[PDB]
Design an enzyme around this catalytic site. Sequence first.
Site, short mmCIF file in Angstrom:
data_model
loop_
_atom_site.label_atom_id
_atom_site.label_comp_id
_atom_site.label_asym_id
_atom_site.label_seq_id
_atom_site.Cartn_x
_atom_site.Cartn_y
_atom_site.Cartn_z
CG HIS A 54 -0.58 0.25 2.50
ND1 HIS A 54 -0.56 -0.77 3.42
CD2 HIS A 54 -0.15 1.39 3.09
CE1 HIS A 54 -0.12 -0.23 4.55
NE2 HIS A 54 0.16 1.06 4.39
N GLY B 260 2.16 6.18 9.69
CA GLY B 260 3.59 6.13 9.44
C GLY B 260 4.26 4.86 9.97
CB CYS C 52 2.38 0.92 7.33
SG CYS C 52 0.69 1.37 7.81
C1 LIG Z 1 -4.28 7.15 10.12
C2 LIG Z 1 -3.63 6.12 11.00
O1 LIG Z 1 -3.35 6.34 12.17
N1 LIG Z 1 -3.36 4.94 10.38
C3 LIG Z 1 -2.75 3.77 10.90
C4 LIG Z 1 -2.52 3.60 12.26
C5 LIG Z 1 -1.95 2.41 12.68
N2 LIG Z 1 -1.60 1.42 11.85
C6 LIG Z 1 -1.82 1.59 10.55
C7 LIG Z 1 -2.40 2.74 10.02
N3 LIG Z 1 -2.74 2.84 8.65
C8 LIG Z 1 -3.84 2.28 8.09
O2 LIG Z 1 -4.59 1.53 8.70
C9 LIG Z 1 -4.17 2.72 6.65
C10 LIG Z 1 -3.18 3.49 5.75
C11 LIG Z 1 -4.79 1.56 5.89
C12 LIG Z 1 -6.13 1.58 5.52
C13 LIG Z 1 -6.70 0.50 4.87
C14 LIG Z 1 -5.94 -0.62 4.57
C15 LIG Z 1 -4.60 -0.62 4.91
CL1 LIG Z 1 -3.61 -1.98 4.45
C16 LIG Z 1 -4.02 0.44 5.57
#
Ligand SMILES: CC(=O)Nc1ccncc1NC(=O)[C@@H](C)c1cccc(Cl)c1
Lengths: 304, 304
Positions: B41, B143, B145
């Site tokens: 992603h 951030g 990920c």
């Molecule tokens: C905004 C925010 O705190 N995000 C996050 C916080 C903690 N972990 C990951 C994330 N990131 C994500 O869950 C997002 C980018 C997302 C959405 C749908 C599918 C996927 Cl594979 C990934």
Amino acid sequence: SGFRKMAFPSGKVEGCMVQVTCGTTTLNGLWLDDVVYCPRHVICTSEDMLNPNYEDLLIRKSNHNFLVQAGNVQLRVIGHSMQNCVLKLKVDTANPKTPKYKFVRIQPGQTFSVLACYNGSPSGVYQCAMRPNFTIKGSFLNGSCGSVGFNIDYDCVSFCYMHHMELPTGVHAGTDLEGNFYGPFVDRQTAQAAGTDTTITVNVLAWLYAAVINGDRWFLNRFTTTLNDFNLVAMKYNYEPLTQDHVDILGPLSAQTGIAVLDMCASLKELLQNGMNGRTILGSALLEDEFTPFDVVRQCSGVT
Amino acid sequence: SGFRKMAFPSGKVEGCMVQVTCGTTTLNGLWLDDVVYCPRHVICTSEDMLNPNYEDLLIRKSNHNFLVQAGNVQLRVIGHSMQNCVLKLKVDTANPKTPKYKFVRIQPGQTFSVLACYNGSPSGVYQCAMRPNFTIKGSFLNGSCGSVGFNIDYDCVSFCYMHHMELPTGVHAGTDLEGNFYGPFVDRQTAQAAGTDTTITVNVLAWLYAAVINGDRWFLNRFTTTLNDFNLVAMKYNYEPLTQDHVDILGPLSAQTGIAVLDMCASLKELLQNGMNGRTILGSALLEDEFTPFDVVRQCSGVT
Ligand SMILES: CC(=O)Nc1ccncc1NC(=O)[C@@H](C)c1cccc(Cl)c1
Ligand SMILES: CC(=O)Nc1ccncc1NC(=O)[C@@H](C)c1cccc(Cl)c1
């Protein structure tokens, strides 16, 4: 989101751990520049620990009696000295992995990471708080002495603790990196009881703010209190009295959530008086006090 | 003595973290040999995450669009490929800090350390368990990920998790290092609910053995039970059914304490049926299930 008892990445400290052997005793040392720091009880046998005269014991010891090993390589000891409860072994080689570092004496209620070690090798890393009674609730076995506690500010490691002793209570006692014990403890195999351990009120409040930030809001109520009214409750439940300095440090968390510090104090007061009623906060069934307001801001903002 | 949620020393993994940028998106990558692994992603904008066609999205991307930075040095990308939900970026330089490593797909109930990272920089380390519903209760922000989960066997790092997603529930989902998600999750900004999360019975039992080893014995009773009788109670309290394989793994802990596994099951049964009555076990007011029997033996024996 999510909140965890997070430790600092331990790599910079792993690169400093060595094994120090003196006679039959083996413990851990911390190698920074051309100096190895370790607990002075390395010169003792269990027989000596009953009532050790460290000055007389160190007199029967020469540079060659201190065996320092960094992984599989032997360091040449060219000097030895006692500073309070630590020995400083001067070696002929500066640690090539020495990070930018400081020695700091932390205050009770502050937190730090511990890199538990055995025979100069790291086994694990966990987050601790210096209890108001100057003990730490760690996880240490025989051979763990010399394991250090530290904090990291970007690239600088602030070493604050060196592990020395386990009290018969199962709690831990140790020194700063100048060899001064935290608390009244002495490095002697004698009955030393840890005084009354209070709960770090400012940390519980910071953790309540972390809970609100991370979604757990059931404990928020329609009440408020004053510092003096809250402190009457804190005394009854063996909680540290809250001061305006504590309120001031909680300022950024109060600004983030929009919940006044005294309003959060009223939630804590009701939690103390009524318990959790079988409920949890951030996966815990008790009030957590080993996260400072700085730890909450750091974890909730992602400081690397 | 003392028992703590201990993580593996993170140094070997810190030496592998890099920053990967593609267009406007920045996340973490894992650099091992001449390959950088990161969530696929990274090629998406938040607009693409609604329903991404990763094959079509990756077609508009060349080696030069993937910016990989290891600290302050830029790595030259000479190849890119998609394997399930991870991108593999071939770089012209092998990581000089590559530890001995393996890629492993862990089982639900197993534990691992997470090195949370932001912009290729480590912020902290904590211990996690892969929940029976294949989610993890971590601490991750935007951030994070690409942050990895791992275990360490002496000098070998077994990478088991790469962080990808936070569900609207606040729980976390990710993949093994071959890009296969743990659980039914897909890398798409859509409503994905985590199924029922059960308690890891074998881990709670191992932690009860750790409590006994470390002095907490109040919960021990004069009773025993059978696997079928205990499992009737476990079903009612959403606990994983205990099998003879679980009893077998608890063998070393049963031998150490001298308490038969089924006797410990009867203590757990009474704890489930009556609660803790305001008491604690290893500083916790709830039954802890994120320590495997291997973790208890490791911590209580000092494996480095
Ligand atoms: C905004 C925010 O705190 N995000 C996050 C916080 C903690 N972990 C990951 C994330 N990131 C994500 O869950 C997002 C980018 C997302 C959405 C749908 C599918 C996927 Cl594979 C990934
Ligand atoms: C046997 C065993 O598990 N020990 C330990 C376990 C955990 N930490 C430290 C230790 N070591 C000690 O507390 C001992 C050597 C001791 C005794 C009296 C005074 C001092 Cl400064 C030191």
